[PDB]
Amino acid sequence: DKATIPSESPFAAAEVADGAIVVDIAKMKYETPELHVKVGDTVTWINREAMPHNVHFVAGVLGEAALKGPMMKKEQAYSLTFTEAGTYDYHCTPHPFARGKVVVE
Ligand SMILES: [Cu+2]
Numbered sequence: 001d002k003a004t005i006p007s008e009s010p011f012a013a014a015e016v017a018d019g020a021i022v023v024d025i026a027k028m029k030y031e032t033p034e035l036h037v038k039v040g041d042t043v044t045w046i047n048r049e050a051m052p053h054n055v056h057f058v059a060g061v062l063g064e065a066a067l068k069g070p071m072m073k074k075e076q077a078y079s080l081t082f083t084e085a086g087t088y089d090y091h092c093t094p095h096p097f098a099r100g101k102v103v104v105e
Pocket of ligand 1: 052053092093098
């Protein structure tokens with residue numbers, strides 16, 4: 001895979017690592033729809049609203065299978081550690097109008 005998953009479960013926003021690279025989700029959108037990170041960086045999404053959201057990378061993007069993240073409730077977080085340079089598009093499973101990408105460089 002081109003990502004590893006610290007926690008299969010969402011976790012609390014206060015449990016996000018110090019100095020984490022955070023993408024907030026609010027207004028049914030990713031607030032940073034294009035994020036550039038380095039190989040080895042961990043990205044953390046944090047849902048800032050009540051409606052549940054996830055991140056979903058279709059098959060072939062981060063690995064052979066789709067990486068369908070867990071649904072995050074308000075003030076829950078989810079992290080992925082990116083291990084290979086490339087451009088990785090994602091969307092929210094129930095809300096596929098909401099799209100983003102991580103560019104790993
Ligand atoms: Cu959503």
